[PDB]
A paper describes a structure:
To this end, we crystallized the D86V mutant. Consequently, the clinical D86V mutation of [name] PYD apparently does not affect its three-dimensional structure in comparison to the wild-type protein. We should note that despite a large variation of chemical space, all wild-type and D86V crystals belonged to the hexagonal space group P63 with four molecules per asymmetric unit, resembling a dimer of dimers. The charge-bridging system is similarly broken as in the wild-type protein, suggesting that this mutant could undergo the conformational switching necessary for dimerization. Indeed, the D86V mutant showed a very similar dimerization tendency to that observed for the wild-type protein. Remarkably, however, the D86V mutant revealed a higher tendency towards aggregation, as indicated by the pronounced void peak. While the engineered L84R mutant showed remarkable properties such as a drastically improved thermal stability that correlates with a strictly monomeric six-α-helix structure, the naturally occurring D86V mutant behaved very much like the wild-type protein despite its severe physiological implications. This suggested that the mechanistic basis for the physiological role of the D86V mutation should relate to its interaction with other relevant components rather than an intrinsic change within the pyrin-domain structure. By contrast, the negative charge is significantly reduced in this potential interface of the D86V mutant. Still, we emphasize that the proposed docking model merely serves to illustrate a possible mechanism for how the D86V mutation can severely affect the interaction of [name] PYD with other binding partner molecules, even if ASC should turn out not to be the physiological binding partner of [name] PYD.
Author numbering:
A (entry chain B): 8 to 99
B (entry chain A): 6 to 93
The structure:
C-alpha cells in the first residue's frame, strides 16, 4: 500500500495548472455514479495534499490505485484527442 | 453496449502515437497480458502494426475489456512521462 500515501502526491505535484484541473474533472466524473456531486465542492477547491487524502477516503486500499491510473489514462487521451482534433481539422 | 473502442476509438489514438510511444504502449501491454496470456502472443504484438495491434486487442480483450486495459496502459504511459519530467 505505497500508492495512496506517497506515490499519488508526487505525480500530482508534477502536474501544472491546466493538468491539475483536468484531473479533478475526471475524478468528479468518476465519483458521480457513486457519490454524485456531493464531494465535488470539496474536490474542486482542494489542495494536492487534501486531494490525496480525499481519494484515500472515498477509495481506500488499491481502490485509489485503480481509479487514479484510469484518470491518468483519460488525461493522456484528452491531450491526444486535443492534438488529433487539430490534425483532422486545421480549423480546430 | 457502446465502447466500440477497438473498432472506432483505439485505431485513431494509436495513429496519434509516434514510434517510441507505440513501443512504450506495447511494453505495458506485455506486462498486462503476461499473467493472463504469458509471452505467447507477445511475439505478435511486438511486431504488430497499429492497425494489427487494434485487432489483437479486439481479439484477446473482447467487449469493454479493450477499453479498460487501454485506459490503464495510457495511465502508465502518462505516469512514465511525468516520472521522466520530475527526474529531469
Amino acid at each position: 500500500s505505497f500508492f495512496p500515501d506517497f506515490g499519488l502526491l508526487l505525480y500530482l505535484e508534477e502536474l501544472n495548472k491546466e493538468e491539475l484541473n483536468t484531473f479533478k474533472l475526471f475524478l468528479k466524473e468518476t465519483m458521480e455514479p457513486e457519490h454524485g456531486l456531493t464531494p465535488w465542492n470539496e474536490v474542486k477547491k482542494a489542495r494536492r495534499e487534501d486531494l490525496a487524502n480525499l481519494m484515500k477516503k472515498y477509495y481506500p486500499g488499491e481502490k485509489a490505485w485503480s481509479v487514479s491510473l484510469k484518470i491518468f489514462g483519460k488525461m493522456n487521451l484528452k491531450v491526444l484527442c486535443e492534438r488529433a482534433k487539430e490534425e483532422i481539422n486545421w480549423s480546430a
